[PDB]
Amino acid sequence: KNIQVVVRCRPFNLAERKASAHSIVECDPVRKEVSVRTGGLADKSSRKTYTFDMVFGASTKQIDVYRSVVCPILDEVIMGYNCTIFAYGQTGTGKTFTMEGERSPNEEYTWEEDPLAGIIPRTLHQIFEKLTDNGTEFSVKVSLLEIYNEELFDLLNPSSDVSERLQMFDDPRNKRGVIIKGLEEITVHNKDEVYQILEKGAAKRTTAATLMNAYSSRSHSVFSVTIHMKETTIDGEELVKIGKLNLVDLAGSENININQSLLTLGRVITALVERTPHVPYRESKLTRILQDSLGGRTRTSIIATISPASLNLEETLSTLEYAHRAKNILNKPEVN
Amino acid sequence: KNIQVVVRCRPFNLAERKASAHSIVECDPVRKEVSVRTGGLADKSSRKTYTFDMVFGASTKQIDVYRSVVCPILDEVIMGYNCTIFAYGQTGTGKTFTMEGERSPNEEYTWEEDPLAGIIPRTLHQIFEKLTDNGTEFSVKVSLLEIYNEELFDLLNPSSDVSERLQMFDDPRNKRGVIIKGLEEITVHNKDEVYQILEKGAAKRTTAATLMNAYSSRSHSVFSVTIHMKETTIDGEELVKIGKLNLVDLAGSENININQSLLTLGRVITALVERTPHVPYRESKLTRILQDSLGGRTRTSIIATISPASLNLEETLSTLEYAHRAKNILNKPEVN
Amino acid sequence: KNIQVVVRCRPFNLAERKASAHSIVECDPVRKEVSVRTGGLADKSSRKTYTFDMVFGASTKQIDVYRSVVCPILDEVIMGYNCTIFAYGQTGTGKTFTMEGERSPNEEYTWEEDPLAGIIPRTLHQIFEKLTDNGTEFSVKVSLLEIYNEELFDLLNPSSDVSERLQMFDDPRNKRGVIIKGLEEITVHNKDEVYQILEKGAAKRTTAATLMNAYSSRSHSVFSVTIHMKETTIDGEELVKIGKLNLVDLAGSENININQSLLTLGRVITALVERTPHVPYRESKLTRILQDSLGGRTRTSIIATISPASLNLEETLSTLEYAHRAKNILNKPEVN
Numbered sequence A, B, C: 001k002n003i004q005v006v007v008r009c010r011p012f013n014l015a016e017r018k019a020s021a022h023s024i025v026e027c028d029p030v031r032k033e034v035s036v037r038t039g040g041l042a043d044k045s046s047r048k049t050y051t052f053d054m055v056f057g058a059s060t061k062q063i064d065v066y067r068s069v070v071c072p073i074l075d076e077v078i079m080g081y082n083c084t085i086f087a088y089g090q091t092g093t094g095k096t097f098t099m100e101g102e103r104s105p106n107e108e109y110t111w112e113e114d115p116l117a118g119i120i121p122r123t124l125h126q127i128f129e130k131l132t133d134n135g136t137e138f139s140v141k142v143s144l145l146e147i148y149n150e151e152l153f154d155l156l157n158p159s160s161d162v163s164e165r166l167q168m169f170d171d172p173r174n175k176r177g178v179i180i181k182g183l184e185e186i187t188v189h190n191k192d193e194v195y196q197i198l199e200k201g202a203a204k205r206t207t208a209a210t211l212m213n214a215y216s217s218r219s220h221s222v223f224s225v226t227i228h229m230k231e232t233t234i235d236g237e238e239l240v241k242i243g244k245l246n247l248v249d250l251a252g253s254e255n256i257n258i259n260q261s262l263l264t265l266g267r268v269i270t271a272l273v274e275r276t277p278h279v280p281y282r283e284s285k286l287t288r289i290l291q292d293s294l295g296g297r298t299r300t301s302i303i304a305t306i307s308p309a310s311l312n313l314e315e316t317l318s319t320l321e322y323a324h325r326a327k328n329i330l331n332k333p334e335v336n
């Protein structure tokens, strides 16, 4: 019902250690609380403390995130629901690391086994174990678009030029959802197809980053997975159940047509929590795509990412405030 | 009468080819049409198509531009009219290349013969052939100023510091024109003087680019040529006919006191085409200089430059829209 | 009474000489006038001329600045007054050079003898000569904070992370002054302590410059010196006299929450000279700190710094105009 909101804090990086950054963040997994030290040299006892559905401190690893947050959501996708997980937070804090992950250098690890892999690869792997281990007939289609400056780009298209644009339209079968005209949806026949698909997507992103200013922090990225499963009743009737999972990595929250989406996202959340009558979904590409995940029939989680350094105090607080409000968004989840 | 407007599209560059840029532009010289592919991955048949006075595709060369556009204008300068050609378009699309040209590397070519030379050098050469081949007594004076951030700089001054500023005043002999106080006008005695004059101007520009932020894309450049010719009537009377040619290379059109001129240019064109009563010439240095070329006694052409890449779709459309409106500007041309 | 305002013009630098910068500034020490050549190529005789309390031309040296401006102020600090000197001017013109100075390269000079040393080191040295040469018991405490984006940072704190923030509060003993909660005030026992203190402060600044965007030009720097002296009356009574000296190096004047202080400074000066009723001290960190120096019981001087190059004409004029107004600020100076 309420959307689930969790917080992940990344460890210090080398720049921060070189600069002797002190920590101002404290995670308590059991009480599910984050607590920010607030008063610098002036007031040593000051704190702001917030309660979330779950809390992940600096030493938390990609496997822990997946086990705690995604497994439950993945089961519900398998039972024929739509789900959305998204990452919100300041640039540099681990939205991408959490949602995609990285490759460990050289040969080192098989992609199914890279400890650095994030939610998207781990999920694609699990869909194959859980549904093959299980008998049952199924197909998996993925897609990956990016929104930048209110234009949409298709990272998995066979087209060789990233800058060729998609277009968006209302679904006549779902008052709350959209059709992306031109989107490539690639059918993923087994887990041995996965990596090449992602690698071509990554190569497409690299080109786009060289074409557009500050691409990697000003853009939103939407990875979707659609699964079709065959169910036979006890009467012997053959009916299909469809589950869809969107994995969204938002533009950096510090950025306030170039910020349109990140700004309409904020107004949308506000209009929902403060129960205002017209909710401005239409006003950005992002919120049209996410409309059903903010107040609709989709089950939603948010991963708020934060830095632990004293330097980013203000933005850290800002992310926590923003994400804590979002707990009061109520969805009405429903199978397809 | 109507001002003449033409379009030049440059070929792909190496960055674009490295990025597998697709083309979205199509020039048809005979029907005089440019046609932009408009719907990316979503709608393959979509186009916007526009008709101009002339159209130059990617494979068009500097010699072709000169033959088609300038010769006719040069004849009319020789017959004692004022003319203005200017380049309008997004940064990176060939305003400078078209108006000045480049030098081919090493020894390679004599400047009169460099295939890379643009309109200004080619014109200065022709003035000397056409008027020496012709008997007739004549003098040629040139000048070159730049407007940046509403300050005027004189690239041909003997002064060693580029940053010394010119000032502007109304001409008491021409309700539509200006005197530039302090401008150096250099007398060009033969074509063997030309290149050194341009080379010193280029060296002055190089310094200015290091002094002022983004100088080369935020500045307007005005090259003028003034020719005095001696005519004897059939009665034996000696009267002088003066022709003047301005060659303007505007700041890049993507830039929206720093954009004052490019912004007042837009309002001026608007006030003329939509027949509004007070036309705000006074409000920028550029439009004061160009006042007689926008709605006055000067004969004007505009060269709109565009990229062919899918990436620049929006600006490409924007340039074509802007330039197509300008066809409805009516001038009343007249000898001096 | 009136605040004292003086002008320092720096010599050309290598970039300017490489670019053949002409000069547009003329200092006349005896008549106390600066005079800016104003009309570029257009009008050679044009000038704007301004009178200040003192005037220092390009060839003036750090020792001259100190002798003329600081000695008098230092005597008055010793007699138990509060004084403030601050530097105002465009980035690149010598606020830091004037207020701190530089180190001559390699071994070269003892810090007490470096010809490049500015007002802060020279002053700390003199406090020790003048008060030891003199018998009399005394202690000296220094402090150094920086304001950036309305946050306060403490460069002399033992804390290893610069980004830990101070907080500000009204002094209940002085309607016109503030307490900085958390500020480290280091006791300086002899002149052999000085340099290490400054060197640690400089190392703290270096880190901050790497943490925050454009730190060195957008930040204000406040160095304070507090001196306690023991006086015995002729009756044999033991009373303490306190003198305080603030040495402020403002953010660059070309920058118009990031400009809040530099903007409220301007409004404050305006409200004083134009005698407006509510003076908006409260509205920035800087003006709260400086409140007593703008219209209060502190004795104030301003050092306006300017470039001599033709290129910076506009900002040069702007600094002179701004500083000339400030001569009409009246203070009511008083011992503690």
Ligand SMILES: Nc1ncnc2c1ncn2[C@@H]1O[C@H](COP(=O)(O)OP(=O)(O)O)[C@@H](O)[C@H]1O
Pocket: A009, A010, A011, A013, A089, A090, A091, A092, A093, A094, A095, A096, A097, A098, A305
């Ligand atoms: N949880 C984490 N553990 C270790 N390193 C991390 C973590 N999160 C982020 N990083 C590192 O910080 C950098 C920024 O992460 P990134 O995902 O790009 O953040 P964002 O996309 O939010 O800007 C990357 O180099 C990443 O390795």
Ligand SMILES: Nc1ncnc2c1ncn2[C@@H]1O[C@H](COP(=O)(O)OP(=O)(O)O)[C@@H](O)[C@H]1O
Pocket: B009, B010, B011, B013, B089, B090, B091, B092, B093, B094, B095, B096, B097, B098, B305
């Ligand atoms: N018509 C053309 N043919 C070949 N190269 C061109 C052409 N127009 C522009 N270029 C190249 O593109 C770059 C940008 O041209 P430039 O004239 O500087 O554009 P602008 O002044 O409009 O920014 C230059 O390197 C130039 O060689």
Ligand SMILES: Nc1ncnc2c1ncn2[C@@H]1O[C@H](COP(=O)(O)OP(=O)(O)O)[C@@H](O)[C@H]1O
Pocket: C009, C010, C011, C013, C089, C090, C091, C092, C093, C094, C095, C096, C097, C098, C305
């Ligand atoms: N009076 C001066 N004499 C010689 N060099 C100077 C003088 N003032 C400034 N400079 C040089 O100019 C540069 C800028 O000085 P700086 O104090 O950093 O100016 P600001 O802090 O006003 O930006 C420094 O390299 C400094 O050496």
Ligand SMILES: CCc1cccc([C@](SCCN)(c2ccccc2)c2cccc(O)c2)c1
Pocket: A096, A099, A100, A101, A102, A103, A104, A111, A114, A116, A117, A118, A120, A121, A195, A198, A199, A201, A202, A205
């Ligand atoms: C860009 C699509 C995507 C999504 C999720 C994970 C990956 C990557 S890391 C994404 C770049 N931030 C990937 C990296 C390099 C080449 C191919 C694939 C991926 C896949 C599997 C495991 C892993 O650790 C990383 C890529």
Ligand SMILES: CCc1cccc([C@](SCCN)(c2ccccc2)c2cccc(O)c2)c1
Pocket: B096, B099, B100, B101, B102, B103, B104, B111, B114, B116, B117, B118, B120, B121, B195, B198, B199, B201, B202, B205
């Ligand atoms: C800057 C004045 C100007 C005008 C038109 C053409 C040129 C140049 S190229 C302008 C730089 N974008 C020129 C280039 C380098 C040195 C001297 C002259 C020029 C002159 C003749 C032929 C030619 O190909 C180029 C220069």
Ligand SMILES: CCc1cccc([C@](SCCN)(c2ccccc2)c2cccc(O)c2)c1
Pocket: C096, C099, C100, C101, C102, C103, C104, C111, C114, C116, C117, C118, C120, C121, C195, C198, C199, C201, C202, C205
């Ligand atoms: C940053 C505090 C401070 C104040 C005034 C003067 C100095 C320096 S130069 C300040 C940097 N712009 C200083 C430079 C490097 C290392 C230690 C001290 C200083 C102290 C004494 C003499 C001198 O020439 C310079 C430092």
Ligand SMILES: [Cl-]
Pocket: A012, A013, A014
């Ligand atoms: Cl690291």
Ligand SMILES: [Cl-]
Pocket: A025, A026, A027, A057, A058, A059
């Ligand atoms: Cl922690």
Ligand SMILES: [Cl-]
Pocket: A063, A113, A114, A115
């Ligand atoms: Cl793992």
Ligand SMILES: [Cl-]
Pocket: A168, A169, A170
């Ligand atoms: Cl629609």
Ligand SMILES: [Cl-]
Pocket: A267
């Ligand atoms: Cl808002």
Ligand SMILES: [Cl-]
Pocket: B012, B013, B014
């Ligand atoms: Cl090329």
Ligand SMILES: [Cl-]
Pocket: B025, B026, B027, B057, B058, B059
């Ligand atoms: Cl073509």
Ligand SMILES: [Cl-]
Pocket: B063, B113, B114, B115
């Ligand atoms: Cl040729």
Ligand SMILES: [Cl-]
Pocket: B168, B169, B170
């Ligand atoms: Cl005038």
Ligand SMILES: [Cl-]
Pocket: B267
């Ligand atoms: Cl407008």
